Amino acid sequence: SRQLVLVVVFVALLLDNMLFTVVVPIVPTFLYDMEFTGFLEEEITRVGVLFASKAVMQLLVNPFVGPLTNRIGYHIPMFAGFVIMFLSTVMFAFSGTYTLLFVARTLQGIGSSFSSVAGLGMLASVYTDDHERGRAMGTALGGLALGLLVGAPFGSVMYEFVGKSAPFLILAFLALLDGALQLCILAKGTPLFMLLKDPYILVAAGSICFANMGVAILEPTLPIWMMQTMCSPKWQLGLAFLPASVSYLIGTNLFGVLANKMGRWLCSLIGMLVVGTSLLCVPLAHNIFGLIGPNAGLGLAIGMVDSSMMPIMGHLVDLRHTSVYGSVYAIADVAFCMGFAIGPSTGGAIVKAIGFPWLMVITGVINIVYAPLCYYLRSPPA
Amino acid sequence: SRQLVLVVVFVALLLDNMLFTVVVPIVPTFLYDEITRVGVLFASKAVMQLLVNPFVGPLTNRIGYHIPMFAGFVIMFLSTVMFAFSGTYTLLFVARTLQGIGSSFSSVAGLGMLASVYTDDHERGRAMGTALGGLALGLLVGAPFGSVMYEFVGKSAPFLILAFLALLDGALQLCILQPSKVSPESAKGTPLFMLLKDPYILVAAGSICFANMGVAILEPTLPIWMMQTMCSPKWQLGLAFLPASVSYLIGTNLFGVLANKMGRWLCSLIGMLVVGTSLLCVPLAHNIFGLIGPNAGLGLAIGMVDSSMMPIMGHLVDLRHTSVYGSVYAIADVAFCMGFAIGPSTGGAIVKAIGFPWLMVITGVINIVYAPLCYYLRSPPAKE
Ligand SMILES: COC(=O)[C@H]1[C@H]2C[C@@H]3c4[nH]c5cc(OC)ccc5c4CCN3C[C@H]2C[C@@H](OC(=O)c2cc(OC)c(OC)c(OC)c2)[C@@H]1OC
Ligand SMILES: NCCc1c[nH]cn1
């Protein structure tokens, strides 16, 4: 049946993004709880590397998944992803040491890569009508956005209420439901390593990566800054990230509707500028109510950048080279993985050497400087 | 009495910038009865006003603000009467230079007087905004006045009317300010070269100078590109830059109101970014109607930057140094005059060398890259 595959891909992507969003409120609070005041400055570098682990492992593992799907079909690598995410979910709840969380994040990265590639390939293979295929991708990405929306308040809110191991056991039980649903189941062109050889696609990917880095580096160091300065309760740390998702969804909807009238490159330029301004204004708030504005602006900005830059990548891939159903997926996935691997990993050294606001100033200046480079993309030729 | 001091600066900036923009309709049509020689006349006011400014700033410390303002009145009246009668190239140069020196005197003295009378930062954030609004109104209404008077009632009429308005302004100034005695300011202000070692003053001056240079480089090179590219009639050249003036006026009053509430540094940052984006999107239009948007954005953002950076100089000089406001506003007028002088003299050479779109791209990129540096003015450290 054509449907069930849509539901299983939905649940897999939702659970993966939920795990990514839920890991952020809990790990620094877990490190605070074990010792007992901040010993965090020694921790900051240690807390980071752990977050960039999944990005680096997914980047390493992504090229190998290509021919593996061709050799042994699509159903087999999907089953491996569910098992690996189940192992990671079980390991997260029962882990007590820092070393276990590292292997948990690495396993989550491997499972995420396998599940995403296999699920998108299976969704492409099941739908052959040539028109409902786009609707399938739209529903799947909407489910991913819904998982992003739901994940952050989940772990932070239901950590101090029903204990620590609960939000990972719930994810494990949800993953088991995904396995049962998927258990009862049943044109090559221009590879990615040559697609990154033209300046237009490189500028587009760089713009996406530099827009995403502002929220990439916010995860490891924002909760620690909150407990160090603002003196907020432990259940508001994940609640503070709701604007970054709600504004992102509102922006992507409105700007996917509206960006074609006034120009895509203008949308991307304005988006990078507002990312820079929001990241500059983030470390000025002295309470949780001060993070509502800059976070919402940053989410709206990232929505503007993504919704204005994905069609540009698609048009550039179509006009010059040959394109497939998911050529844009690989190019954008390299951007997100590159950002999540470089930003959080290098941010620990910056936070240790110099203060927190200097990292935000650096990110804002980098975004504002890279913003004028989107003029290159207006009317590309060849 | 502090409300009448703002009326004097409003009238002084209204008539002084009236004679600046009234003249560009009438000069190149009279001399025809070669483009470079006509352009150098337009840069005469800015070239000499820059040099007079360093000698005018510290002079306000010793004799007060009334005497320089009366001198600017007398010089502007002499300039307009010299304009109304002379009819040669050599006699249309000294008059422009006199207009420049009078504008320098009036601007520096008026800004210093407004800063001294209005002490509160929040309350000082509106008087300078309304003064810049008066400047915007003068720049807006000068050109059509000169065009219609030259078309209908000869050439001497628009300058004679300006002379009569100048006499009215002088009578008003003698009535309100009493420029008849020399009053020395008690506080000995900091020397001017010491102020240039201040990073925050330099950043504010750089922001004002870059924004005004970006706006000023557009007027002398825009009509040439219009004729070269879209083949427009002559009558739309003046009307193309009208939205810039209107948006500048609306922005200057509205954001003089809103800068204190929303923040000076955020206002300067957003204004410089908007100026950069507008300058970047200017050279893409293919018809007259496509320039309505970018020009309006440029005017709004330039009003943003001017209204934000006017009170910041006084706030810095009050926070870190002694309380005398002549020198830093002389610096701001120097930035304005440098921006207005660099453009008209070299615009044709730059466009013939690299081209109009590259010039617009460079200006927008410079503004965007400098825009991060306004974060430094959020909270300067105070003096010991
Ligand atoms: C985390 O997991 C992700 O990495 C996703 C998000 C990354 C980032 C983010 N992380 C947060 C973590 C938080 O916790 C505290 C709070 C807020 C945020 C935000 C707000 C801002 N934000 C954007 C999120 C978007 C997701 O990507 C897509 O939706 C997408 C869209 C497409 O087009 C429609 C694609 O092409 C078809 C595509 O494939 C290449 C992917 C992206 O990858 C799956
Ligand atoms: N400070 C006013 C600069 C300007 C704007 N428009 C024309 N000139």
CATH number at residue B202: 1.20.1250.20
B251/B300 Cα distance (integer angstroms): 5
Do residues B56 and B171 touch, judged by C-beta distance below 8 A? no
Specify whether B272 is located in the same domain as B304: yes
Do residues B332 and B108 touch, judged by C-beta distance below 8 A? no
Specify whether A313 is located in the same domain as A222: yes
CB-CB neighbors (< 8 A) of A276 in chain B:
372
**Given A273, A365, A378, which is nearest B273 (Cβ)?**
A273
The answer to whether the Cβ–Cβ distance between B368 and A365 falls below 8 Å is: no
CB-CB neighbors (< 8 A) of A371 in chain B:
368
Specify whether A365 is located in the same domain as A218: yes
Do residues B19 and B80 touch, judged by C-beta distance below 8 A? yes
- Listed in sequence order, the residues at least 6 apart from B239 whose beta carbon sits closer than 8 Å to its beta carbon are none
Read off the DSSP letter of residue B232. Answer: -
CB-CB neighbors (< 8 A) of A365 in chain B:
372
Provide the number of structural domains found in chain A: 2
By C-alpha distance, which of B84, B103, B61, B88 is closest to B327?
B61
Task: Copy the structure tokens of residue B148.
Answer: 């219609």
- CA A214, A219, A223: angle at the middle one, nearest 5? 125
Specify whether A165 is located in the same domain as A205: no
**Cβ atoms < 10 Å from Cβ of B289:** 8
Helices (H), A263-291: 264-281
Cα–Cα separations (whole angstroms), residue B73 to A308, A356, B14, B43: 55, 54, 12, 21
Question: A370: nearest CA in chain B?
Answer: B369
- Listed in sequence order, the residues at least 6 apart from B82 whose beta carbon sits closer than 8 Å to its beta carbon are B91, B94, B95, B98
Using DSSP's 3-state secondary structure scheme, residue A328 falls into: helix
Specify whether A168 is located in the same domain as A65: yes
Cα–Cα separations (whole angstroms), residue A330 to A242, A317, B4, B251: 28, 12, 68, 45
Cα–Cα separations (whole angstroms), residue B147 to A9, B30, B32, B135: 71, 12, 16, 19
The answer to whether the Cβ–Cβ distance between A276 and B361 falls below 8 Å is: no
Task: Copy the structure tokens of residue A224.
Answer: 């620690």
Query: What is the number of the ligand closest to the CA of B300?
Result: 2
Do residues A239 and A153 touch, judged by C-beta distance below 8 A? yes
Helices (H), chain B: 2-22, 27-32, 35-42, 44-56, 59-63, 66-85, 94-117, 121-153, 156-176, 192-195, 199-216, 218-229, 236-240, 242-262, 264-281, 292-320, 326-353, 356-370
In the block, tokens 């098992």 appear at: A83
Q: Is A208 in the pocket of ligand 1 (CB under 6 A)?
A: no
Could you report how far apart the first and last alpha carbons of chain A are, in Å? Answer: 43
Specify whether B277 is located in the same domain as B155: no
> Which of A264, A278, A280 is most worth mutating to test chain B (most B CB atoms within 10 A of its CB)?
A280
Resolution in A: 3.7
CA A286 to mean position of chain CA atoms: 27
Specify whether B2 is located in the same domain as B97: yes
By C-alpha distance, which of B196, B314, B338 is closest to B264?
B314
Specify whether A241 is located in the same domain as A373: yes
B115/B315 Cα distance (integer angstroms): 10
The reply to whether A362 touches chain B by the CB within 8 Å rule is no
Residue A354 backbone zone (phi > 0: left; psi -120 to 50: alpha; other: beta): beta
Using DSSP's 3-state secondary structure scheme, residue B44 falls into: helix
Q: Provide Rg for chain B, Cα atoms.
A: 20
Ligand 1 atom closest to A238 (CA): 15
How were these coordinates obtained? Answer: cryo-EM
Read off the DSSP letter of residue A229. Answer: I
Domain boundaries, position B344: 189-384
A374/B301 Cα distance (integer angstroms): 21
Q: Which of B171, B186, B201 is the last residue of a domain?
A: B186
The reply to whether A366 touches chain B by the CB within 8 Å rule is no
Chain A 127-146, residues with CB within 8 Å of chain B CB atoms: none
Specify whether B114 is located in the same domain as B39: yes
Distance from CA of B71 to the nearest CA of A (A): 45
Using DSSP's 3-state secondary structure scheme, residue A197 falls into: coil
Ligand 2 atom closest to B302 (CA): 5
Q: Which of A186, A213, A232 is the last residue of a domain?
A: A186
CA B349 to mean position of chain CA atoms: 24
Do residues A328 and A313 touch, judged by C-beta distance below 8 A? yes
By C-alpha distance, which of A26, A52, A10, A55 is closest to A349?
A52
Task: Copy the structure tokens of residue A264.
Answer: 């895509």
By C-alpha distance, which of B66, B105, B8 is closest to B185?
B66
Specify whether A174 is located in the same domain as A90: yes
Specify whether B111 is located in the same domain as B197: no
Specify whether A21 is located in the same domain as A169: yes
A271/A370 Cα distance (integer angstroms): 11
Task: Copy the structure tokens of residue B100.
Answer: 């420049």
In the block, tokens 């304009």 appear at: B83
Q: Which of B186, B206, B239 is the last residue of a domain?
A: B186
- Listed in sequence order, the residues at least 6 apart from A105 whose beta carbon sits closer than 8 Å to its beta carbon are A23, A50, A51, A53, A54, A57, A88
A126/A122 Cα distance (integer angstroms): 6
Do residues B115 and B314 touch, judged by C-beta distance below 8 A? yes
Q: Is A74 in the pocket of ligand 1 (CB under 6 A)?
A: no
Distance from CA of B303 to the nearest CA of A (A): 20
Cα–Cα separations (whole angstroms), residue A239 to A11, A21, A29, A40, A154: 23, 11, 14, 21, 8
**Cβ atoms < 10 Å from Cβ of B154:** 10
Q: Is A243 in the pocket of ligand 1 (CB under 6 A)?
A: no
The reply to whether B262 touches chain A by the CB within 8 Å rule is no
